[PDB]
Amino acid sequence: DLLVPKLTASVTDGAVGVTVDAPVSVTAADGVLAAVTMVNDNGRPVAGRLSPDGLRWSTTEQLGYNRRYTLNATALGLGGAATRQLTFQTSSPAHLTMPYVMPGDGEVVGVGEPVAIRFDENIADRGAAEKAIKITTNPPVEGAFYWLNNREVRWRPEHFWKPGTAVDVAVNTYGVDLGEGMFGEDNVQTHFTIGDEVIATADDNTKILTVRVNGEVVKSMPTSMGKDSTPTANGIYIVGSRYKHIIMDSSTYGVPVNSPNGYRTDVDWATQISYSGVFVHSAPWSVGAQGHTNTSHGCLNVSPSNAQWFYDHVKRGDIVEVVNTVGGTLPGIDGLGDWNIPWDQWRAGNAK
Ligand SMILES: *C(=O)CC(=O)[C@@H](C)CC(=O)C(=O)O
């Protein structure tokens, strides 16, 4: 004997806290869908599509926070007709946080470049945030998340990227509970590629900044680094932004200008390598000391032509390594200091 059609939805009638990170769907068995409509509270229909075989209907546009939706579906079969009405209520956030991802879409960056997702609000459930961030790499390589502060999480492999790696970042935070009633305001997505290996090494024993490109020495720059009382920290630096010129203002990095180690200086050809305020930059006033003596507040002073060369040939995500200074080691949570955190510590993370 014949059977009556059955209607199954990806939600149920009376549901609350329905999350809007996924489409809503309806499926017919023992029959086909003859009509499916979904309206919000205000009678506005929601866009949807019925599969060609008539069995599956799904929403096709974003579903909104704080809504009551009503589904009406009818299924017909040889055995008769069935109709259902489902009303459900979606998540009601207390807060919304918007994520901002670096590096930029379509960019080509150095082998030291981490994926960065910065939220504009403190994240209570770091684990939920991590889970919602989908990273694809090609060639595939293991990586892991680490939080630099309450708002910004970083993802990187254990070692520098292999040049030519495609990296894809899907921050799928819309509809996701990030804790304490905070939900993602929107999704973001970036895709970037790893370019040549560029590693510049500043050795305090020689006072030379050597630039190597895929293992080959292409540039050797006499440099003057931080004087003993304001040394350049040892360790690994990720290259950040670059400037044809910039006013370096110590107060930006915590030191009052009118302090003994304060300064406010206009400089050319400046490449930032730490949030703490270390740059490679043109320093014509210390060209005599470069290659011989440290005289700066911590920056890598090099000649005008070498600073410009550095500006022209080094890109975001390239690496500067400092060795043998009287300084300590650059903090791992500096912002550009990710690689100074040991991998076991990085991999274990701090989602807590
Ligand atoms: C960088 O943060 C500050 C520096 O170390 C350079 C600007 C050089 C410098 O301060 C100097 O007086 O030579």
Ligand 1 contacts (CB < 6 A) are 226, 248, 263, 265, 277-279, 283, 286, 295-299, 301
Which of 204, 296, 330 maximizes ligand 1 atoms within 8 Å of its Cβ, making it the mutation to test the pocket?
296
CATH of 92-195+338-352, one of 2.60.40.10, 2.60.40.3710, 3.10.20.340, 3.50.50.60: 2.60.40.3710
**From 191, 281, 297, 313, active-site residue:** 281
Resolution (A): 2.2
The amino acid at residue 95 is H
Cα(160) to centroid(ligand 1), Å: 29
Residue 205's DSSP bridge partners are: none
Least Cα distance to 330 among 298, 303, 308, 305 occurs for: 298
Has 159 been annotated as catalytic? no
Q: Which residues are annotated as a binding site for Ca(2+)?
A: 177, 180-181
Which position has the token pair 């299924």?
Answer: 75
How is 69-117 classified by DSSP, letter by letter?
Answer: EEEEEEEEETTEEEEEEEEEEB---SEEE-EEEES-TT-EE-TT--EEE
The sheet carrying 68-77 orders its strands as 32-40, 68-77, 80-89
DSSP secondary-structure letter at 287? T
The experimental technique behind this entry is X-ray
Structure tokens at 201: 């090494």
For tokens 């076991």, what's the residue?
A: 344
Kindly compute the dihedral angle of the four CA atoms of residues 138, 316, 299, 159, in this order, to the nearest 10 degrees. Answer: 0
Residue ranges per structural domain of the chain: 1-91, 92-195+338-352, 196-337
Tally of helices (H runs) and strands (E runs) in the chain: 3, 27
206 burial level (CB within 10 Å; 0-12, 13-18, 19+): middle
Residue nearest to atom 9 of ligand 1 (CA): 296
Active site residue 297: no
The class (CATH top level) of 196-337 is mainly beta
